[PDB]
Amino acid sequence: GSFVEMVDNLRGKSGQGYYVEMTVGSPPQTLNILVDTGSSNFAVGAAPHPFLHRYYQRQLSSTYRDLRKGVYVPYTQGKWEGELGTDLVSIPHGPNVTVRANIAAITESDKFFINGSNWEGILGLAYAEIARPDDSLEPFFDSLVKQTHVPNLFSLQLCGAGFPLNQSEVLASVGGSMIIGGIDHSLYTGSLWYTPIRREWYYEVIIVRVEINGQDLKMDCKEYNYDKSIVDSGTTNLRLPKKVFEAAVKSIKAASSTEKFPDGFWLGEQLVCWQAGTTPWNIFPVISLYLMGEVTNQSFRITILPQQYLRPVEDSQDDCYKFAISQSSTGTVMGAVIMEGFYVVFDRARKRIGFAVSACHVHDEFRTAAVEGPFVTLDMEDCGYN
Numbered sequence: 001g002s003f004v005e006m007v008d009n010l011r012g013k014s015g016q017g018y019y020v021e022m023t024v025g026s027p028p029q030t031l032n033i034l035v036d037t038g039s040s041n042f043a044v045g046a047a048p049h050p051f052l053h054r055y056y057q058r059q060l061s062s063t064y065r066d067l068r069k070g071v072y073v074p075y076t077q078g079k080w081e082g083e084l085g086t087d088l089v090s091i092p093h094g095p096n097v098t099v100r101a102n103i104a105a106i107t108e109s110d111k112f113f114i115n116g117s118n119w120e121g122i123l124g125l126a127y128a129e130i131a132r133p134d135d136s137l138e139p140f141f142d143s144l145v146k147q148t149h150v151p152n153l154f155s156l157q158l159c160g161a162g163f164p165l166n167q168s169e170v171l172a173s174v175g176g177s178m179i180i181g182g183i184d185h186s187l188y189t190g191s192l193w194y195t196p197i198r199r200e201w202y203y204e205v206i207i208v209r210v211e212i213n214g215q216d217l218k219m220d221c222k223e224y225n226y227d228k229s230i231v232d233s234g235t236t237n238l239r240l241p242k243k244v245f246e247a248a249v250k251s252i253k254a255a256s257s258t259e260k261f262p263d264g265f266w267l268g269e270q271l272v273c274w275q276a277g278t279t280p281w282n283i284f285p286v287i288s289l290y291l292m293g294e295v296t297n298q299s300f301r302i303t304i305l306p307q308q309y310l311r312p313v314e315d316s317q318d319d320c321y322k323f324a325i326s327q328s329s330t331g332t333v334m335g336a337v338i339m340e341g342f343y344v345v346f347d348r349a350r351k352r353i354g355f356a357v358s359a360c361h362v363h364d365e366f367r368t369a370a371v372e373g374p375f376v377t378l379d380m381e382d383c384g385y386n
């Protein structure tokens with residue numbers, strides 16, 4: 001229904017991540033924590049770092065418990081190593097509960113903490129299967145549900161500004177909402193449409209059809225989910241499998257053919273700029289991803305605008321952007337640029353993910369993002385990769 005205490009509790013942006021305030025220890029130590037549906041560990045800076053202005057001080061927490069075990073988590077993004085322990089954790093603009101949770105106290109890291117992000121840790125919201133060192137390390141959300149009456153569901157409204165936010169603006173601006181235990185009806189318009197969670201590890205889904213301005217990409221649907229498709233608040237871009245990326249970029253280029261962009265733009269490396277207020281949104285196509293429905297042989301589609309896939313960046317008074325669709329060798333990743341178009345419901349209890357048009361999606365007077373259905377779709381199980 002209505003969760004006023006949790007609405008507008010996020011800050012950040014697609015390039016740096018969206019974070020929520022949390023407290024760890026007794027007395028409480030306030031930290032800003034990245035909301036990450038693409039991982040399953042609660043890991044916080046616990047030692048001085050040039051890019052951290054605060055960190056978790058275990059020696060100052062009377063409720064700190066040492067698990068006497070280390071963990072090393074290498075990624076292609078940042079690498080981190082930490083010391084496992086437990087402590088009391090709260091979310092000030094969240095449910096009015098305090099839970100005992102696992103915390104990986106980061107003592108060393110490489111390219112993990114980013115200069116100017118304003119976050120000191122990561123809240124991994126995915127399932128125990130992908131927790132490090134192994135699935136015996138109960139994720140935060142699992143602890144929260146076990147220890148309290150909080151329903152086994154959370155929902156995210158990530159709010160892209162539609163323009164660059166400087167260092168001060170990004171600290172003062174509302175970046176969205178994380179509703180823990182419910183669905184807030186003020187955060188979306190129209191209906192919520194649900195897609196099954198294929199398997200409980202990452203938030204895995206199945207894409208059944210892809211269109212660029214209504215034109216079918218016409219690839220075998222298995223290609224769209226090769227080797228998986230996930231919903232990840234911890235990824236900036238919409239990431240597509242190599243072959244899907246090559247077909248999508250060819251189609252987006254054909255649709256926007258009245259303006260030639262350098263190769264660097266399509267590679268997501270170079271920005272493109274237009275005179276203030278003249279961005280030619282109309283020349284770029286809409287993108288629709290059809291997802292498996294809850295009813296047999298039924299699908300629905302989510303449609304994003306270039307206002308979602310063109311990420312605003314500062315150059316001048318020009319309006320500049322980077323292309324926020326990129327290739328992947330690890331499957332489709334529906335990152336922040338996709339999530340900014342929708343209110344996304346992580347219905348863990350009913351093993352499903354809901355999508356509705358976000359009340360904060362950026363658009364123009366001519367087009368809006370959309371969530372529509374149903375469509376009759378056959379052999380959708382065949383779209384899943386094994």
Ligand SMILES: CC#Cc1cncc(-c2cc(Cl)c([C@]3(C)CC(=O)N(C)C(=N)N3)s2)c1
Pocket residue numbers: 013014015016017018034036037038039075076077078079112114122232233234235236336
């Ligand atoms: C939006 C946003 C963001 C954003 C900004 N800066 C750092 C990060 C992240 C750094 C690291 Cl490491 C992250 C991990 C744990 C591993 C990974 O590789 N992906 C992809 C994740 N889901 N989770 S997210 C995210």
